[PDB]
Structure 1
Amino acid sequence: FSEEQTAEFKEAFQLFDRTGDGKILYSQCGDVMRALGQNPTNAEVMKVLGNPKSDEMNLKTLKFEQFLPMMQTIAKNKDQGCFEDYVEGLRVFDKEGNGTVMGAEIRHVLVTLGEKMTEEEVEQLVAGHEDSNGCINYEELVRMVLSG
C-alpha cells in the first residue's frame, strides 16, 4: 500500500484503541479492513487471526504491525466476485425463476447460512428492494451489494 493510503489506515487504526497504547481488539480487524476497500470474510480473517472463539475474540489484541500485515495478507486477493458471479449468486432467491427475489427468504439465508447475520444485518441489506408482494429485482440487488 502507498504511504498515503496507509496514513489513512494509520488513523483508521489509531482511532480504534483501548488502554491508549497502539492496541486494537481482534474484533475490529475485519470491519476496519472492510472500510479500507476490502470485504474480508470472517472465515478469511479467522485464518489470519488464528481461530479465536467469542471470548478471546473479544479479548485478544492487535497492534499496528499485526494489523497492517493482516490487511495486506487478505488484500492481495484470490476469488472476489463480479456481476456475473453475483447475479447467479443472487438469482439465489428466485422462487420459480422469476428475475425477482424472495422477501422473507433473503432475510432467512442471511440468518441461516455460514456467516450468520443478525436480524439487524439481514434487514438492512434487504429492506425496500422488494415490491408489494415482496419480490426483489436481484439484477439490481447485485449491483447494490457490489458497489457501495
Structure 2
Amino acid sequence: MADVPKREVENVEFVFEVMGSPGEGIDAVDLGDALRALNLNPTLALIEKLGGTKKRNEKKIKLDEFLPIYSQVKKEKEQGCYEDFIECLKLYDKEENGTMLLAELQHALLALGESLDDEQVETLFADCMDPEDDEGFIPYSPFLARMCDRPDQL
C-alpha cells in the first residue's frame, strides 16, 4: 500500500486484468510482455533470470509474485536508452552525416545479440523506419526516436 508507489501498483493491476486471469495470473511466457506493457524494455536474458518460460501453461505468475519482478526491472538503471543507441549506430555512420546502410542495420538486428525474427524487424521498419535513399542509406536518428517513444527528438 505504501511500499511501492500506489499509482504504479494500479498500473500493474490494469495489465493483469488484460493479460492474466484473477485466479491464476499471467502465464510466465507473458512475463516479458507484461513488463513491456508497463513501459519497460528488459532483455530476453533478464526475463529468463526472473521466471521467464518458453511455451504456454508451463508456469503461472500471480500478482504479488510479479510485483518484486517489476520493481527489480525498474531498479536496474542501465538497460538502454535513445542516447545509448545513437552511439551504437554512429559506429556505422561512415559519412558522419547521421545515416547508415539499412542492410547493415537489418543484418545486425537479425544476427547479433538477442536476435529478432524476420517478422519483428519488418513490422519495426514499417512503422518507425523512413524510406531508403538511392544508395540504400537511412536516417537512424528518427528510427530510434520512434521506437524509443522520444517525440522530443523528432
Normalised-by-shorter TM-score class: 0.7 to 0.9
Instruction: Specify the alignment match of 1:101 in structure 2.
Output: 100
- Could you tell me whether the CA contact under 8 Å between 1:38 and 1:75 is conserved in 2? yes
1:88 aligns with 2:48: no
Instruction: Specify the alignment match of 2:65 in structure 1.
Output: 66
Instruction: From the superposition, tell whether residues 96 and 31 of structure 1 become closer, same or farther in structure 2 (CA, over 3 Å).
Output: same
Task: Give TM-score scaled by structure 2 length.
Answer: 0.77
User: Partners of 1:32 and 1:38 in 2: how far apart?
Assistant: 9
- Could you tell me whether the CA contact under 8 Å between 1:101 and 1:138 is conserved in 2? yes
Instruction: From the superposition, tell whether residues 63 and 92 of structure 1 become closer, same or farther in structure 2 (CA, over 3 Å).
Output: farther
- Could you tell me whether the CA contact under 8 Å between 1:107 and 1:126 is conserved in 2? no
Instruction: From the superposition, tell whether residues 58 and 42 of structure 1 become closer, same or farther in structure 2 (CA, over 3 Å).
Output: farther
Instruction: Specify the alignment match of 2:20 in structure 1.
Output: 17
What secondary structure does 1:7 align onto?
Answer: helix
What secondary structure does 2:64 align onto?
Answer: helix
User: Partners of 1:80 and 1:7 in 2: how far apart?
Assistant: 24
Runs of at least 5 residues in structure 1 that lack an aligned partner in the other structure: none
Instruction: Specify the alignment match of 2:131 in structure 1.
Output: 130
Instruction: From the superposition, tell whether residues 83 and 10 of structure 1 become closer, same or farther in structure 2 (CA, over 3 Å).
Output: closer
Task: Give TM-score scaled by structure 1 length.
Answer: 0.79
Runs of at least 5 residues in structure 2 that lack an aligned partner in the other structure: none
User: Partners of 1:95 and 1:111 in 2: how far apart?
Assistant: 21
Aligned-pair distance for 1:98? 5.2
Alignment RMSD = 2.5
* Identity fraction in percent: 33
Aligned-pair distance for 1:92? 4.7
User: 5 Å matches for 1:32-47?
Assistant: 32-47=34-49
User: Partners of 1:92 and 1:27 in 2: how far apart?
Assistant: 34
- Could you tell me whether the CA contact under 8 Å between 2:42 and 2:79 is conserved in 1? no
Moved more, 75-84 or 23-32: 75-84
Instruction: From the superposition, tell whether residues 63 and 15 of structure 1 become closer, same or farther in structure 2 (CA, over 3 Å).
Output: same
